[PDB]
Design a protein around this ligand. Sequence first.
Ligand SMILES: Nc1ncnc2c1ncn2[C@@H]1O[C@H](COP(=O)(O)CP(=O)(O)OP(=O)(O)O)[C@@H](O)[C@H]1O
Ligand SMILES: Nc1ncnc2c1ncn2[C@@H]1O[C@H](COP(=O)(O)CP(=O)(O)OP(=O)(O)O)[C@@H](O)[C@H]1O
Ligand SMILES: Nc1ncnc2c1ncn2[C@@H]1O[C@H](COP(=O)(O)CP(=O)(O)OP(=O)(O)O)[C@@H](O)[C@H]1O
Ligand SMILES: Nc1ncnc2c1ncn2[C@@H]1O[C@H](COP(=O)(O)CP(=O)(O)OP(=O)(O)O)[C@@H](O)[C@H]1O
Ligand SMILES: Nc1ncnc2c1ncn2[C@@H]1O[C@H](COP(=O)(O)CP(=O)(O)OP(=O)(O)O)[C@@H](O)[C@H]1O
Ligand SMILES: Nc1ncnc2c1ncn2[C@@H]1O[C@H](COP(=O)(O)CP(=O)(O)OP(=O)(O)O)[C@@H](O)[C@H]1O
Lengths: 303, 300, 305, 303, 300, 305
Amino acid sequence: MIHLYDAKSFAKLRAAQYAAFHTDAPGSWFDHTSGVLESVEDGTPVLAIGVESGDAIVFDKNAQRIVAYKEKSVKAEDGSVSVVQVENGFMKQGHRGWLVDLTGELVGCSPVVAEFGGHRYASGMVIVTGKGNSGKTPLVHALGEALGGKDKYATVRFGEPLSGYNTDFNVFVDDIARAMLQHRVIVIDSLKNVIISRGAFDLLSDIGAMAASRGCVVIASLNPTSNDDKIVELVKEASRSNSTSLVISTDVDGEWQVLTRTGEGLQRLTHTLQTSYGEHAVLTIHTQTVIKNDELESVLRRL
Amino acid sequence: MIHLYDAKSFAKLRAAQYAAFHTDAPGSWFDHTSGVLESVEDGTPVLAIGVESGDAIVFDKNAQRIVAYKEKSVKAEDGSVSVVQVENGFMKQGHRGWLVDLTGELVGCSPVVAEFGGHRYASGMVIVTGKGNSGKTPLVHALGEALGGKDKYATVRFGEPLSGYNTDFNVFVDDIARAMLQHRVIVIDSLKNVIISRGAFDLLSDIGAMAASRGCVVIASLNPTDKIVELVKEASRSNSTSLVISTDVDGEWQVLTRTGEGLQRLTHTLQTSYGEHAVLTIHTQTVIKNDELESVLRRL
Amino acid sequence: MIHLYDAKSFAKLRAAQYAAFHTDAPGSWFDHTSGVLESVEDGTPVLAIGVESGDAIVFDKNAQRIVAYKEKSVKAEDGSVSVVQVENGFMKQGHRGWLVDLTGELVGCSPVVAEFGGHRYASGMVIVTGKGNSGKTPLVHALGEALGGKDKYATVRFGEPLSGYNTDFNVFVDDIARAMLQHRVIVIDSLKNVIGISRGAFDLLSDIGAMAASRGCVVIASLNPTSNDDKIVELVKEASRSNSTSLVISTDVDGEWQVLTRTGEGLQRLTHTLQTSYGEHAVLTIHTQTVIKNDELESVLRRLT
Amino acid sequence: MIHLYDAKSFAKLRAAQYAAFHTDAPGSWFDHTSGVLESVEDGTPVLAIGVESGDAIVFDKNAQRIVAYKEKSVKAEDGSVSVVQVENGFMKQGHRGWLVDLTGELVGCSPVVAEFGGHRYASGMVIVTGKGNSGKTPLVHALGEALGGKDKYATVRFGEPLSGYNTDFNVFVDDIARAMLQHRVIVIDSLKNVIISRGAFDLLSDIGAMAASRGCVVIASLNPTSNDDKIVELVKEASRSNSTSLVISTDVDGEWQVLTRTGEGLQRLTHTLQTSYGEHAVLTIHTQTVIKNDELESVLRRL
Amino acid sequence: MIHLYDAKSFAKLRAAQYAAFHTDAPGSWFDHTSGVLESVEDGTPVLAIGVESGDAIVFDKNAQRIVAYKEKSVKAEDGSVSVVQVENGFMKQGHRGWLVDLTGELVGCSPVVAEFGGHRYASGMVIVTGKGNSGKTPLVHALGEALGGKDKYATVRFGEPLSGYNTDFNVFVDDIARAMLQHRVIVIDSLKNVIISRGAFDLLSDIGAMAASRGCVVIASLNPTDKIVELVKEASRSNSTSLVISTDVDGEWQVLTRTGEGLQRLTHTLQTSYGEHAVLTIHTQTVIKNDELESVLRRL
Amino acid sequence: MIHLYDAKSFAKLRAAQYAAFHTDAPGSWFDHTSGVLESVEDGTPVLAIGVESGDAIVFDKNAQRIVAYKEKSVKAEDGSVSVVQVENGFMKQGHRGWLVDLTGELVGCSPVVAEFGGHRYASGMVIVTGKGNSGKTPLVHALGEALGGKDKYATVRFGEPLSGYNTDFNVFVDDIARAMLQHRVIVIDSLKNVIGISRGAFDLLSDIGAMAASRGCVVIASLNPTSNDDKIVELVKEASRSNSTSLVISTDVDGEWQVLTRTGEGLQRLTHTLQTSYGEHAVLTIHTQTVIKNDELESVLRRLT
Ligand SMILES: Nc1ncnc2c1ncn2[C@@H]1O[C@H](COP(=O)(O)CP(=O)(O)OP(=O)(O)O)[C@@H](O)[C@H]1O
Ligand SMILES: Nc1ncnc2c1ncn2[C@@H]1O[C@H](COP(=O)(O)CP(=O)(O)OP(=O)(O)O)[C@@H](O)[C@H]1O
Ligand SMILES: Nc1ncnc2c1ncn2[C@@H]1O[C@H](COP(=O)(O)CP(=O)(O)OP(=O)(O)O)[C@@H](O)[C@H]1O
Ligand SMILES: Nc1ncnc2c1ncn2[C@@H]1O[C@H](COP(=O)(O)CP(=O)(O)OP(=O)(O)O)[C@@H](O)[C@H]1O
Ligand SMILES: Nc1ncnc2c1ncn2[C@@H]1O[C@H](COP(=O)(O)CP(=O)(O)OP(=O)(O)O)[C@@H](O)[C@H]1O
Ligand SMILES: Nc1ncnc2c1ncn2[C@@H]1O[C@H](COP(=O)(O)CP(=O)(O)OP(=O)(O)O)[C@@H](O)[C@H]1O
């Protein structure tokens, strides 16, 4: 919905946004949105995600796909009406994203998902990318474990020529929806085959917002392989503006920079990570400064 | 509709256009068009806006979407017939834009929306863009508050990877229609994901006119993040009523304002600074030729 | 239809074409085609114009849109059959353009639409374009008034972020059809969003000049060559060079414009210079025969870069 | 249909092809094909031409469009079957081009259409093009009159912003079909708007063959306007390989080169034309050498 | 179908492939496949070829087009089922190419089609191309006559602005199917208009295999008249069984012949001259590596 | 499905992945997945592969195509539901790839398919490519024989102008499905026409490596990088780099090839050099662990220019 502001109510939002990343307990928002989802009466649609064609599939609170659902109009506070209808396993009426309000007046936030090694990490989508010899796949699994903390992280596998990997986009989005519905920390390996169909474009523009609203983090690997001049800009656009955070490799092997958006129209934070391999290629991450736009664009130009 | 002119009736229009920006009370036009919308008998379509596919959804005066509406033919003054029909939530007959006449003979104007810091600002669409370190999002919220004045401004959020942001274009246009139907000052953050579907092209070409006719202002951020750059330049140059663009110095912005159909564009400079929690404050008439304008556009 | 010629009948056509621009009374052709349209029995389709999709809408002599019309076959002189059918507000059979013969044997002309400041102006489409500081919008309104003369000119507004401007292409073509059906002098502001591409937009660019020249009316359209994208500027150049009957283009000096006029199908293009100035409330006033070769023409077009 | 050859029957074809251009009386072939068309029983389809969509409209011997026609299978000599069917004004079965055999064993010819100023001109399509100040429109009308000789030439008008000009492609092809069905010399002004829809591509590839088979000549103006690098190659391809003859302007105003294909796999002929204007811009053309491929490509590179 | 191999059965295939080009009598394979086609019971589909849309038309052994044919499932040796069905003149089920097995275990061959002037020529598709002043059309007719030998060659004409030339792709493929069904040596003039529709892409990828399986040769002219040049190079390099290309000297041509699946390509030089009425006469084993091959292709 | 991990269960997966390539018996995985397929009750869909249009055809355990199959919902361990439905010979519901779980918790592996000349080779797709004079076709047949070992290898032929070669994409994918369902070692000659693009072709390139690695079979495909068109060579590089489990590429010296093998999802790539020579009738014979970094890998890929 839309929101009205004056100087005073806008100042409050800014303070609340600052708290959502800087002072709230890590994982709080996820726990809150879990409660909201749990309170939804059983069978009610909560999440719609776009399939390859551009149509959408719909899930309930238990991550069960909804095949049929009678038309149902819900009137919001501001007067706006949201209608949801499902027929033959596809969304007839409604929109992509969260079908129940998980956020209320608390919008434009990057809810803190976890704290590791003295740094706070944001929910939403984290893209892991860059060039050089530093491996993406070992990093995303290390990050998934680290941000998981006490909790296990979920792995969605997609589009690699290895055993057990799904390569069908429609199964991929089904896995993602379920992961965001049930887990705080989610790893995607990889985002190469989405990088184009309507579903793929939708996913790139939707997933960051879906995750930030949930309070979960989606850690996606994206190897910038080809040199074709239009596709590299799509990698840069996904890295710059479709991701809540960016994790990018550097000139030195094992070393990564983390760039974190802290909130709608707020300054982006940067910190450096050191890593090393243990037995069987398991990577271990070793244990606040702002960044301007020219520094940001300088980092993007390494891709 | 079409309009006929001779020297005399054209001279009157020019005078009336000049007044609509320079001498009319700020917010007047919005208040007038509010009255026109309020006088529309209940259930009559007033606004149609294009969805992603290129079809259109239709709203009444209360910003309620119309699912069904019997065919209805209205004859204009010039003899042209406008037919409106809605079925299954979509426009069967009609056009995108305002479905009732908000303007009459008063066309080609940039109705003054507000006055702030000694400068008059135009209704229609304002695109906030540019490169460098000056932030777009804090500027649009500061501008929304400033032009709001006594009134609260409306915020439409779209296409950012942050909490509560809608990313579905069809919800986005629903929010916009409602905002223009009910509020004088409107902020859009951001216009990146529209920058391509039929709906997106329609919106870029429609929204400035929709807003200028209403007397409301739509302040939209557009971070120019490689040929599309021309689509950013075209949106900035010719699809926006005003342009707010960053400069070499951080916090400093130039405002370029179209004052009317075939009139000179005005320019003024804004200074800004941040307070607590990254809240931006804007500190408190010269014409610009085309070569100066194109020089400004070439910074994008 | 098609036309047969020998040396003699072709020479007559050339003479008649020369007269249609150089010696006929200004506005004559418009008055003649008005009479032809008026003689059409009521309800008969006269004009079809393409909408955004590429389908066509159809109008009668009174500029009323035709929703339904029984199939009807009309045999021309050369033996060619033109069938017209309309159903559910769209053309089922027929073609875009004039559905009745307004021209007969008199084809390939640029019928003189008006005379102003010692110069004759052609009917058809005039594109007003160019770069520099000289404003397009004030010029088209000044030209509309000047060529209007005793008559008011019609203004079609399209695709600007200002009050009352329609931005829907299908309403735009409805306005244009009505304008050409009822008025000799017509202003379009602006032609940017058609250059911004749909089937209707391509059709309009290729159709409108011929529609207007056949009517004897003039369509004065502004076209600001904004973007530097290398394919779109050629579409501006192509519209200026070959889809317009006349070209009005700005120069290095502010207020000064060159007018390039096609006088007839295989004929030399004429050029003259206009001076202008602003009065009160930004009202522009235009102040009061030489041929041009192709290399001079292409030289003029290369300023649109 | 297909044709079988040995050394001897192939040598005969070559001789017959040589005669069709060099020794046959000018206009002979047209008169012969007129007789063939006249002998077709009334109502039988003779010509199909593609409309904008790529569907085809069909005409009888009198240049009357056929709205409906029962399915009808005709067996050729070699065993090949040609089926023709028309329904709702469009071709259901059949092919684009001539629906009756106008040529028999006499194929690959450029039947002489006329003789003017000591030079023989070929039937088929002549494209008039080039850059510089020499006007295309006055040249095509002068050529139409000259090759017409005793006969009037037909003018098809298309795609110019002048009075009486049709701009609808479907009317354009209707005019062309009628012109080729009834007249030996045909002028098209202009071929700019076809230069893309299926109909336009079809027309460019079809018309030369349609005309050469009829023994009529189609003289089409084509101003090479824009500099866009793919469209100029389409102008070059139409000039080089879709036209039977090419008439192209030179460095000197009023002077034109004519390049004529004399037959399937035969040498191309070249000659120079001088012109001048009389009263009311009427152009007058003033009154055998072979050309190799490198000379031909050199001429094309002026476009 | 698929084939299984070990060292021994693979060695046999290689020997049989070598013989199919180097030692078998010229024209043998054509005569054998003629017998196979003749033994097909009347009305059974034998060949399917793609039309402009990408659908396929189907022919019987007599080169008669099949309008209707009941669904019919044939089980191959490896267990794979081939179903053929035709309805309303188009293939409902099946595949493009030969619908009856003409080859069996004998696959990957270039069956010798003829011997002329001391050189053996392969069946399949021969593309005649190149730049310079040496004419393509006279060469293909000379080659058609020479490889014909005692037999007349068939000429398919397509896409030239000359009398009697068909320009409709669907008639073109009908002519080709009939030619391959009934004749060993076939000339196509020209392959320019196919060089894009689904049918055209299909034909380029299908025809070489169709011809090599039949034991017939398709000699196609292709004048390389700006990126499509790669489509000409790809057709010349990998879609043709043999390549005949002009040289720096007029009348002189190089012939590059694939002798079999994964075998070395052979090269020889041809001299030609014109007689009366532009009739060309061709005057009367060395391997070539890949770098020499790519060097030849770079002249296009 | 999705998998949950902590440090400990992730460490186990890594160890199991290492074993799947380095210590398991060659061909083991194939034999295990054969058993899984054999235990599927008869008539149940096991494999779906995309045809030219982008629709999918479906096969049972015996490599028989399924024309019709009632809707059937199977619930996985994680709660995710997989529905399979076939009608009129095409997949109505389901996904491309394996329709039964062949892998369980054992994912991200490169199951060892064979051992030859002191080197272990991975299952999945091997692309054989490169420039220079070293022949692709003789190499793939030599590799098929060598990795076959005691077993015959299957040959799928596609898109060459030689006798008996199928050129229809829909037959090609039918052959491939059957090959992977019944044989451990599979040769494809060639992969040029799929790079020559339809939905089916794009699907196949992105699907086949995973299909094969999951089965424990190896698909050895030749891919001659012919044309110099700048977008198509990147599609060859992308297929070689990221769509293939292993890469076999020719070198400056004739007969010599480099083999680059992915050992597992987040693991180091291995490299070794092969020498070859021809015997009688052009039969190629291959003569009888070092890791490679990314910059060395990209250096190898840049030879395909
Ligand atoms: N123990 C170890 N030591 C050093 N480097 C290692 C390593 N284990 C893995 N790596 C590196 O990690 C990389 C593997 O991950 P990535 O390259 O980022 C994605 P990928 O597995 O190559 O799939 P892709 O084909 O989609 O790129 C390898 O290039 C390898 O060099
Ligand atoms: N207190 C403060 N002091 C200085 N700069 C600040 C600030 N708060 C925010 N900014 C600047 O404002 C910018 C944020 O606004 P935008 O220009 O719209 C980029 P964004 O919206 O965050 O990402 P996007 O371009 O993907 O939408 C940042 O570049 C940041 O440097
Ligand atoms: N009184 C006056 N004196 C000098 N110049 C004037 C003027 N009134 C108008 N102009 C000039 O006329 C121009 C307006 O016309 P144009 O710029 O050519 C098209 P536009 O109406 O601005 O729409 P566009 O900019 O979206 O294309 C202004 O840029 C201004 O410089
Ligand atoms: N009497 C005359 N003397 C010299 N040149 C003449 C002439 N009459 C006509 N011309 C030339 O002939 C040309 C007109 O024909 P063309 O340019 O070849 C096609 P066009 O009429 O310009 O339509 P186009 O817009 O499609 O190009 C003019 O450029 C003109 O210079
Ligand atoms: N008697 C002769 N002496 C020398 N050259 C001859 C000849 N007869 C024909 N030629 C050459 O053969 C060529 C004709 O064959 P092609 O190379 O196929 C070109 P085309 O088929 O005529 O046009 P196209 O490329 O548009 O198909 C001409 O270039 C001509 O110079
Ligand atoms: N006995 C032998 N000695 C040396 N080289 C041989 C050989 N047998 C085959 N070759 C080489 O192997 C090559 C054949 O394989 P490739 O060229 O790599 C693919 P192809 O089978 O030719 O199909 P393509 O050319 O359409 O891609 C020949 O070019 C030849 O040089």
